[PDB]
């Protein structure tokens with residue numbers, strides 16, 4: 001982001017990171033610069049990830065909410081990429097930028113193992129995901145926010161009039177209609193809570209059967225089942241091995257997943273009926289995301305094809321898959 005780029009002096013800030021985490025520049029290796037500057041850190045045969053944002057993008061209060069939730073999960077025995085306390089004991093280190101803002105550094109453990117590959121993509125993985133997500137939801141039920149200042153967002157706070165062309169009347173009607181239905185869903189301790197909100201196979205590592213999640217940047221309050229539907233949406237979108245039949249792959253994924261999940265959390269079967277609304281809601285979000293990403297002026301025929309496919313799905317309230325999830329009772 002250009003306002004942040006304008007301020008960042010990588011060598012100056014990374015020297016701070018050296019003073020703050022005890023890892024020399026030699027051992028700090030650039031990885032990405034999208035929503036954070038991301039570096040891998042290596043020391044004593046161990047690996048860590050360092051992320052850096054800024055106050056122009058995120059408040060420390062906000063990120064402290066994430067840190068608090070990770071601590072709770074780790075404390076309860078869930079394998080997560082734990083934040084690493086700086087030499088001053090902090091999970092977030094604020095580095096003054098010299099002009100009234102701060103860079104926000106944080107370091108996490110590098111999750112053991114690798115992103116899943118074709119040999120790992122099978123019913124045992126989908127079962128394991130189910131077990132792991134069930135443990136996660138179970139543990140979030142006992143999470144106690146320490147103060148309202150660190151409070152994360154509600155399900156409907158990250159719809160598309162800001163980013164979509166204002167003449168797409170039918171898009172907004174369907175989306176409005178969808179969000180109004182969803183607002184009426186019951187929220188209680190056994191249906192709704194702080195959840196990861198962005199589970200896919202880019203966001204976890206697999207190490208001889210053991211899952212560890214990372215990228216908790218966007219955690220928020222949401223329904224347990226929507227947390228689950230977001231995983232489903234992503235695995236339907238970019239599976240590691242392509243599937244032949246969408247509905248039957250959706251059905252089997254959720255069968256394997258729910259068998260594992262039922263070992264670890266009790267979520268009422270009435271929730272199954274709302275998997276297709278939640279898949280549709282994620283479709284709406286993506287469509288809004290692609291309008292923010294795309295410059296409609298400089299966009300080719302393929303980008304417009306993508307946009308068109310999404311647009312007619314939304315407009316016609318088309319199911320993302322035809323599988324009937326109520327049969328997995």
Ligand SMILES: Nc1ncnc2c1ncn2[C@@H]1O[C@H](COP(=O)(O)OP(=O)(O)OP(=O)(O)O)[C@@H](O)[C@H]1O
Nearest residue numbers: 031032033034038049081108109110111202214215
């Ligand atoms: N705690 C962590 N443990 C292990 N790997 C991590 C951790 N955090 C981030 N990564 C990995 O380091 C990089 C983080 O980069 P970033 O989140 O900016 O990119 P991404 O959008 O996830 O993926 P890509 O850049 O490949 O499209 C990714 O390759 C990510 O999978």
